[PDB]
């Protein structure tokens, strides 16, 4: 029983060793993801900064082009949602 008490133990143990070497890659990939997501925070801060202060201007009709031509606008109501929806 002692042989049995050792041989399978060593075999399982070697399997554990292999799985452990596989698992230590977790820490590495996880910290790389952490840093990359930190860069995502850095760039998302800038994209809000740019989007928060944006100019929306209506060109108007200073040229005096006839209204027939200026008729490039849809005439059908379309239901779109923004935040709530």
């Amino acid at each position: 029983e002692i042989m049995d008490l050792l041989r399978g133990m060593d075999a399982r143990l070697q399997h554990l060793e292999q799985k452990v070497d596989k698992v230590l890659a977790q820490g590495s990939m996880v910290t790389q993801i952490k840093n990359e997501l930190s860069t995502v925070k850095t760039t998302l801060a800038t994209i809000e900064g740019m989007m928060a202060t944006v100019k929306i201007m209506d060109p108007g009709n200073p040229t005096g082009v006839p209204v027939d031509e200026l008729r490039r606008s849809f005439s059908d109501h379309v239901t779109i949602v923004s935040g709530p929806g």
């Binding site: 100019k55 009709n61 005096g64 200026l70 008729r71 005439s75 059908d76 935040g83 709530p84």
Partner: protein
């Protein structure tokens, strides 16, 4: 029919330059008009136009040949003659040249008659006011303390009104207007003969035609032409100048303004002659310069003189714009203009805002009017998206907070975005108040948050909105029908196209004559997007009348469907979403509004009797805001409002429809310059067209814009961490920035600290407004530490400035309304006199002026007959006996006379019983000597008129005297009845019935023919019954001049009705001749009534005999109310004096105390503490079950049942009788009616723009205490006593007086008076008559509700 639809007496339409140019060119009249001046009219084929209209061309040729014959030099061309042809704005300095004094007798007869009539009653009125002062104060100098100078009586008023300057001009233009109106009336009838009138006065030749007049002055060698509207405007301006100058001459209060106003008038008249139509820019600059001069006295150095300098620079630019004046001449003109505003009190500096209408109005052109809006609108605009979303987040916060504080403090259905923080999560879960400081942070999360359906709002919730007539434009195919046919006929013949059909429809008539009408399906026009796809839609502008500013000279009109959608959307916004915003103090009650404004202005004044409270006021006008609104700054707010109301796409309609459509200015005499522009869509962005508008329209969607502005103001206030109270008005706004300063600081330093604190708020507000697209210039912004501007009224240091001259300027000689009766004109004059009393003018002088102008109006109506009558017996009887004129003018309107201003009306707005006040006035006049006791006996013994139960119940307090109702209201009621009869709208299916008068008479008899008659109870029950609701709905119609004309056309009046409407004035004069001529023989028992008899007893007896036919001896109860002047016997205590009534028996008094040392417009520490004065108390029920959301029908039925039970008894028979009168409006059974009925005790019996009752100058420092008195009739009596005491205190120290060196105490001893009587009611009153068979509109929703409970 043409004798009723007479030409208008006063200006109501814009002055069109091209109309006068068309008339001048039609007849080849001499002129020096340049080809550029004529505009499009120069290239018109005048040969064809003269071929048509031959009567018009014949008249014009006749006046032209008369001008040539009179002045041979007019044949000379190339302006080589000495005569200069001038258009209206350049004839201002030569108005006094036109005299026509000779060959003109009617004005002289009118003046002589007025003088003769006034000479008989001046002393009597002086005695009357002396007795009033003695009775109300115990001293004979109540009205003459501030003036003692000179006391103007009625004779003095007439002398200085008929002898001052502009009097001859007013008489010569009144005669000209009368003659031209006669000619127009004759031309309408088709007389076609003698339609040209020539006066040919020496040195002044005038030729009158139904189209235009030709005035030539030999002294100045200037000939001018004026159209009918120009003549009306000139005579209105001259009448205003006369009134203003005469009032300045009369009142000691306005005496300093006389010379300044005269000099200003002369200077601007010369400027008008030198410039043209550009002088109205200077007039508007003067309007702003009034406020600039008001700001010149500000304690803060940084804010004093900024507006003054800016307005001076603007005036210099306007003067030197066209190089009429060089720099030095413009500087001299500016100095002369500004020197008239210096060294004036703030009140007078605001009463120089009367001169705006004193220079007439400019001649308008459609192209010029369209140029301004095309410059402002249709322009690129850069918007800040961060500012838009911050404003939207604060809009959400304000909407949520407004839905809270109501609806049991529960948040509206809302959806939170994914970014919302935990604090927002818990606040939505908790339903707590959204603190604005919290909302400032996490604004991204406050925004993007949807408020789901909050209201079950229905478009048909309000019925009054659909009954108001609005101008509607023609379809996009008949858009050329507005122009005159003569001008467009050649263009349409060249293009070989059919002439457009003229459009004359009205929105009200379209709504009333609509078979299938439903607001639910009407809003689908905008909801489904059909408006964007509608080709027939056409929106057009039209020139606005009585407008002098460049902005606001046009108002827009839209198609029927689009206008209906607009009014429905505005009503939807105002009913539910508008009520959610309490940040602004706007309320439908004027009393609460003026109280709020007084408190806001009195924030900064704190006396010495820590950290005080300081305020800096900021006012900006929003007139130009409408053109600057863009779709991108309103899409999110409107998107949230759509979600809240549940309609997917209702708002944002104005911009979406406007960018796709081409707008134009519709003027009959202003066709497009290019004759080849036959269609609207392909027009260019010039001339009268506005291609692809991108802004808004004034008035349209005002609620949404006001809410957006409120959100912006709140955002700015929180951004600077400053406390403010907004008061956005739509066209104006006022902000009071609040900060805490040291008490020990000097007032100037506290004001400086307040301005420094408000600087950051102003910067943030300007930044946010720029972000949302509204640039704020120096014109809009007025920063002052003392005053803010609201409703064209200045709130200066806790007061309201008088602006009485603006009220006196519009006191003309005839009402513009249709009937043109003497009674209507006298009522208008009395109303203007009441306004003068409220606006600081001497009460004694106002009484004298009311009497004088009543006499003047009656004399004018007698000697200037509107309609020629075959029999002149009445007119000759009145003209030959001026004593009859005086007796009729001094008789109160309740007794048949033309005196519409009672003596007690001079002090308190609220009057309880008009008949008691009339009797008191008659007694005062008898005691003085103005009238005679036999006049009172004739009134008592007068034969009862043709009155029924319906007139007694509908209008209580009225005697059974014929011709107390002017023909004007008869015409209005006829128009309303005609509109109702032909109405086919589903919403009014059962409102109209042929037996409505019979039903009303039967119900009134049922309620009144009892053991004890109660006119007030019957009135309230009738009003709250079904028939009263139908009468109210029928009275919802506006009944405008166009509506009245349409009703008279489609439903012509009978010959007898026509004759009585035409000769109502003569019939009324003849009817009153039976009492104002000789002492009639009366019953012997009437001699018990004397001049010492209490007015209440006389009123009771007079009501008993007057309604003797109806009542057969039964007395009338529940109407009598003590006359405020006669009820109280006041006494004024100065220094060591004592009250005689207090020392002799009487111990009831209303305590009024005025401290000493008060100095207005001085250091707030010196004068006693200030407070909001008593301006009045409105309605303010303990019902068994408090039903929420109860319909109008349910409330009406409950009030009807309560009043019936309280008045006629609490027996079960009375309950069954009231059950029917309640079931005529609801479907309750007896049990639910009894349970839901409010408490039937102490019935109020109450039933039926910004005009403050006083300046509140010295009434703010007053002290009141009614502890020593008994204390809803008693409450009304005590409120009237308090208001009378406040008015007495105010008139003791008139606006001329600004200090009080001694403390004053007013008592107003209401005790020991005969007018105080016990009140008894709630007695048993059996019906005495079966309940009439009443037809109820069961199917009508607005009258009957089958389900009054949920």
């Amino acid at each position: 029919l043409n004798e009723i639809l007479l030409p208008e007496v006063h200006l109501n339409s814009p002055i069109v330059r091209y109309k006068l140019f068309y008339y001048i060119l039609h007849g080849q009249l001499p002129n020096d008009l340049e080809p550029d001046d004529l505009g499009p009219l120069a290239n018109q084929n005048w040969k064809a136009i003269r071929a048509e209209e031959s009567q018009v061309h014949a008249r014009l040729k006749q006046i032209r040949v008369e001008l040539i014959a009179r002045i041979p030099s007019l044949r000379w061309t190339r302006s080589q003659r000495e005569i200069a042809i001038l258009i209206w704005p350049r004839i201002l300095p030569i108005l006094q040249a036109y005299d026509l004094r000779q060959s003109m007798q009617l004005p002289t007869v009118w003046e002589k008659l007025t003088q003769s009539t006034v000479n008989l009653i001046s002393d009597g009125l002086e005695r009357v006011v002396l007795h009033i002062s003695n009775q109300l104060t115990g001293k004979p100098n109540l009205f003459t303390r501030s003036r003692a100078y000179s006391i103007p009586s009625t004779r003095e008023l007439s002398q200085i009104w008929f002898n001052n300057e502009w009097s001859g001009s007013v008489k010569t233009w009144l005669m000209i207007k009368y003659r031209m109106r006669q000619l127009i009336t004759n031309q309408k009838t088709g007389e076609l003969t003698d339609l040209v009138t020539i006066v040919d006065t020496r040195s002044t030749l005038c030729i009158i035609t139904p189209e235009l007049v030709a005035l030539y002055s030999s002294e100045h060698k200037a000939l001018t032409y004026l159209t009918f509207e120009m003549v009306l405007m000139v005579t209105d301006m001259l009448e205003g100048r006369l009134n203003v100058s005469s009032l300045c001459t009369a009142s000691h209060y306005l005496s300093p303004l006389k010379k300044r106003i005269e000099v200003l008038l002369t200077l601007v008249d010369d400027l008008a002659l030198l410039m043209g139509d550009k002088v109205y820019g200077i007039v508007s600059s003067l309007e702003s310069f009034v406020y600039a001069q008001l700001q010149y006295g500000d304690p803060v150095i940084d804010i004093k003189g900024t507006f003054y300098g800016f307005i001076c620079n603007e005036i210099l630019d306007l003067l030197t714009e066209d190089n009429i004046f060089t720099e030095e001449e413009a500087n001299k003109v500016l100095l002369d203009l500004t020197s008239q505003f210096d060294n004036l009190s703030p009140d007078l500096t605001a009463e120089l805002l009367c001169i705006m209408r004193l220079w007439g109005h400019p001649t308008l052109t459609a192209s010029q009017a369209a140029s301004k809006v095309r410059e402002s609108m249709c322009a690129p605009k850069v918007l800040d998206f961060q500012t838009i979303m911050k404003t939207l987040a604060f809009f959400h916060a304000i909407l949520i907070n407004g839905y809270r504080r109501s609806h049991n403090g529960i948040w509206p259905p809302t959806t939170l975005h994914g970014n919302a923080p935990k604090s927002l999560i818990e606040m939505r879960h908790d339903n707590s108040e959204l603190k604005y400081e919290y909302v400032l942070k996490n604004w991204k999360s406050i925004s993007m948050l949807r408020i789901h359906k909050c209201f079950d709002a229905s478009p048909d919730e309000d019925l009054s909105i659909f009954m108001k007539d609005k101008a509607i434009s023609c379809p996009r195919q008949d858009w050329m029908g507005v122009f005159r046919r003569s001008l467009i006929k050649q263009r349409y013949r060249d293009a070989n196209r059919p002439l457009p059909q003229p459009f004359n429809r009205r929105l009200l008539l379209n709504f009333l004559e609509d078979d299938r009408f439903d607001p639910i399906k009407e809003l689908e026009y905008v909801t489904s997007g059909e408006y964007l796809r509608d080709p027939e839609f056409c929106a057009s502008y039209s020139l606005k009348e009585k407008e002098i500013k460049a902005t606001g000279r046009i108002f827009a009109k839209m198609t029927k469907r689009m206008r209906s959608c607009q009014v429905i959307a505005e009503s939807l916004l105002a009913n539910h979403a508008g009520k959610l915003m309490r940040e602004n103090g706007v309320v439908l009650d004027q009393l609460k509004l003026t109280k709020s404004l007084l408190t806001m202005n009195q924030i900064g004044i704190i006396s010495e009797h820590g950290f005080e409270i300081a305020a800096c006021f900021l006012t900006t006008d929003l007139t130009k805001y409408c053109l600057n609104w863009r779709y991108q700054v309103i899409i999110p707010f409107a998107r949230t409002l759509n979600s809240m109301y549940g309609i997917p796409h209702l708002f944002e309609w104005i911009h979406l429809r406007l960018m796709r459509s081409t707008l134009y200015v519709g003027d009959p005499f202003n066709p497009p310059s290019d004759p080849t522009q036959l269609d609207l869509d392909t027009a260019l962005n010039d001339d009268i067209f506005i291609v692809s508008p991108r802004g808004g329209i004034e008035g349209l969607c005002q609620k949404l814009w006001t809410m957006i502005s409120i959100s912006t103001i709140i955002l700015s206030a929180t951004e600077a961490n400053t406390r403010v109270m907004s008061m956005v008005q739509g066209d104006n706004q006022a902000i009071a920035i609040t900060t805490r300063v040291v008490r020990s600081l000097s007032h100037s330093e506290k004001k400086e600290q307040a301005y420094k604190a408000s600087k950051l708020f102003f910067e943030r507000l300007r930044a946010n407004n720029h972000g949302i697209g509204h640039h704020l210039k120096e014109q809009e912004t007025i920063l002052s530490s003392d005053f803010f501007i609201y409703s064209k009224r200045v709130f200066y240091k806790g007061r309201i400035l008088t602006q009485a001259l603006k009220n006196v300027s519009k006191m003309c000689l005839t009402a513009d309304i249709l009937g043109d009766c003497s009674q209507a004109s006298c009522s208008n004059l009395a109303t203007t006199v009441m306004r003068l009393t409220e606006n600081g003018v001497e009460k004694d002088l106002c009484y004298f002026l009311n009497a004088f102008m009543t006499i003047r109006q009656l004399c004018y109506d007698l000697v200037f007959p509107q309609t020629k009558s075959l029999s002149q017996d009445i007119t000759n009887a009145y003209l030959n006996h001026p004593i009859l004129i005086s007796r009729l003018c001094l008789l109160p309107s309740q007794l048949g006379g033309l005196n519409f201003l009672s003596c007690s009306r001079l002090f308190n707005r609220n009057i309880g019983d008009p008949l008691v006040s009339a009797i008191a006035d008659v007694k005062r006049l008898i005691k003085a000597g103005c009238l005679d006791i036999w006049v009172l006996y004739n009134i008592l013994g007068r034969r009862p008129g043709k009155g029924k139960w319906s007139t007694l119940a509908a209008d209580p307090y009225t005697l059974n005297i014929d011709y107390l109702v002017p023909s004007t209201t008869f015409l209005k009621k006829h128009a309303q009845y005609t509109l109702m009869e032909r109405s086919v709208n589903p919403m009014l299916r059962g409102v109209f019935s042929e037996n409505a008068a019979e039903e009303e008479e039967e119900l009134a008899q049922y309620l009144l023919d009892r053991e004890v008659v109660m006119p007030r109870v019957a009135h309230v029950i009738l009003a709250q019954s079904s028939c009263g609701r139908r009468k109210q709905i029928q009275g919802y119609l506006d009944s405008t001049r166009t509506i009245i004309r349409y009703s008279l056309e489609v439903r012509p009046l009978s010959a007898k009705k026509l004759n009585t409407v035409i000769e109502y004035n003569l019939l009324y004069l003849s009817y009153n001749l039976e009492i104002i001529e000789k002492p009639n023989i009366v019953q012997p028992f009437l001699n018990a009534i004397n001049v010492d008899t209490c007015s209440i007893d006389i009123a009771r007896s007079l009501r008993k005999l007057s309604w003797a036919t109806l009542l057969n001896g039964r007395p009338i109860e529940g109407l009598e109310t003590p006359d405020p002047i006669e009820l109280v016997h006041g006494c004024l205590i100065i220094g060591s004096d004592e009250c005689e009534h207090c020392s002799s028996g009487d111990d009831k008094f209303t305590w009024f105390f005025l401290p000493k040392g008060i100095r207005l417009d001085d250091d707030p520490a010196s004068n006693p503490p200030i407070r909001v004065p008593y301006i009045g108390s409105k309605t303010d029920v303990a019902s068994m079950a408090y039903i929420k959301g109860a319909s109008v029908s349910l409330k009406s039925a409950l009030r009807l049942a309560g009043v019936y039970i309280w008045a006629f008894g609490d027996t079960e028979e009375s309950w069954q009788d009231a059950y029917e009168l309640a079931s005529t409006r609801v479907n309750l059974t007896l049990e639910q009616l009894q349970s839901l009925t409010p408490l039937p005790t102490s019935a109020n019996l109450v039933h039926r723009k910004f005009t403050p009752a006083s300046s509140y100058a010295f009434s703010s420092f007053v002290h009141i205490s009614n502890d020593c008195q008994i204390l809803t009739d008693s409450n009304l009596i005590y409120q009237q006593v308090m208001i009378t005491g406040l008015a007495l205190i105010e008139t003791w120290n008139n606006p001329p007086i600004n200090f009080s060196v001694y403390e004053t105490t007013l008592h107003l001893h209401t005790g020991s008076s005969c007018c105080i009587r016990p009140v008894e009611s709630c007695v048993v009153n059996p019906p005495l008559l079966p309940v009439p068979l009443i037809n109820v509109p069961q199917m009508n929703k607005f009258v009957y509700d089958p389900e009054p409970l949920s």
